């Protein structure tokens, strides 16, 4: 059995809490309250020859809580930086979170990038290939996800588990 600490970071309203609720509880709430104090959840997945347990910190994404984030990413072995594919500003914010992790988090941290709300592709503002290229150039594990439909939610956590 292996255990890893994972943190979710990203602009407010991109769907961080929804992503963790979908992965941990199989839930999705159309009306999810903005996170004030970082929330903690845990979930276990089954790989080829190992049981991986995730200790997950779901951080508040509003800027006024930015100064608290290092308390949650310090020592994290993995991070999922989330943006909303319908909001380019949220994608730019995600890149800045990635920069902060590369400079202040553990040098061996595994960073995944979630282009969330992919079910709203009819309102896309961030091109998939552009995000894929950005992730490849920055050594980030990228997937578009939908906490609403479950698209790639189990998949992104499992892919992270395999690389830990
Ligand atoms: N269509 C759609 N809506 C989503 C998706 N993920 C989250 N949402 C919606 O987006 C809103 C905000 O989601 P939430 O999980 O609270 O975002 P957050 O990133 O945790 N916000 P904060 O950082 O303020 O805590 C909610 O109304 C939620 O239902 C998704 O994949 N698709
Ligand atoms: Mg939240």
Swiss-Prot record:
Binding positions (Mg(2+)): 17, 35
Recorded consequence of changing residue 103 to E: No effect on RABEP1 binding affinity
Keywords: Cell membrane, Cell projection, Cytoplasm, Cytoplasmic vesicle, Endocytosis, Endosome, Glycoprotein, GTP-binding, Hydrolase, Lipoprotein, Membrane, Nucleotide-binding, Phagocytosis, Phosphoprotein, Prenylation, Protein transport, Transport
Family named by the database record: Belongs to the small GTPase superfamily. Rab family.
Subcellular location: Cell membrane; Early endosome membrane; Melanosome; Cytoplasmic vesicle
Catalytic activity: GTP + H2O = GDP + phosphate + H(+)
Organism for this UniProt entry: Homo sapiens (Human)
Signal peptide extent: none
Span(s) of short sequence motif Switch 2: 60-76
Residues carrying sugar: 103
Cofactor(s) this protein requires: Mg(2+)
Motif (Switch 1): 27-39
Lipid biosynthesis listed as a keyword: no
Principal subcellular localisation of the protein: membrane
Binding-site positions, GTP: 12-13, 15-18, 29-30, 35, 61, 116-117, 119, 147-148
Quaternary structure (record): Interacts with SGSM1 and SGSM3. Interacts with PIK3CB. Interacts with GDI1; this promotes dissociation from membranes; phosphorylation at Ser-67 disrupts this interaction. Interacts with GDI2; phosphorylation at Ser-67 disrupts the interaction. Interacts with EEA1. Interacts with RIN1 and GAPVD1, which regulate its pathway, probably by acting as a GEF. Interacts with RINL. Interacts with ALS2CL, SUN2, ZFYVE20 and RUFY1. Interacts with RABEP1; one RABEP1 homodimer binds two RAB5A chains, but at opposite sides of the dimer. Interacts with OCRL. Interacts with INPP5F.
Domain of life of the source: Eukaryota
Modified residues annotated as Phosphoserine in this record: 67
Membrane topology of the entry: Lipid-anchor
Protein name: Ras-related protein Rab-5A
Stated role: The small GTPases Rab are key regulators of intracellular membrane trafficking, from the formation of transport vesicles to their fusion with membranes. Rabs cycle between an inactive GDP-bound form and an active GTP-bound form that is able to recruit to membranes different sets of downstream effectors directly responsible for vesicle formation, movement, tethering and fusion. RAB5A is required for the fusion of plasma membranes and early endosomes. Contributes to the regulation of filopodia extension. Required for the exosomal release of SDCBP, CD63, PDCD6IP and syndecan.
Residue numbers of the full-length protein present here: 18 to 181 of 215
